[PDB]
Amino acid sequence: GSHMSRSVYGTTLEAITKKSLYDLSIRCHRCQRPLGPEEKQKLVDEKKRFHEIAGRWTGQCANCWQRTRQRNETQV
Ligand SMILES: [Zn+2]
């Protein structure tokens, strides 16, 4: 609803958003597509924050991000 750009942790989502990471449809802010399981996990895994705008959550999907790591071999 009337919310603003806020970045919080997964454990904070569990309480505020009141649904677990796995269920909660968070989009990649670069793709506008939802995050898969590991992609949601990567943010909590690598200790990133999820970004809310107007009560809509967004993050970054590993689809782009995993491959954004240069020290990942040319296979995937
Ligand atoms: Zn993406």
Domain count for the chain, please give it. Answer: 1
Q: Where are the beta strands (DSSP E) in 13-76?
A: 27-28, 50-53, 56-59
Distance 28 CA to ligand 1 centre (A): 5
Distance 10 CA to ligand 1 centre (A): 18
Centre a 10 Å sphere on the Cβ of residue 14 and count the other Cβ atoms it contains: 13
Residue that is written with structure tokens 């603003």 in the block: 4
Range of the domain at 46: 1-76
Distance CA 59, CA 48 (A): 9
Distance 66 CA to ligand 1 centre (A): 9
Which amino acid is it at 68?
A: T
Q: CATH number of the domain that 72 lies in? A: 3.30.240.40
Any residues with CB less than 8 A from the CB of 53 and at least 6 apart, and which?
3, 4, 5
Q: Enumerate residues with CB within 5 Å of ligand 1 (an ion).
A: 28, 30-31, 61, 64
Any residues with CB less than 8 A from the CB of 60 and at least 6 apart, and which?
28, 29, 30, 35, 39, 42, 43, 48
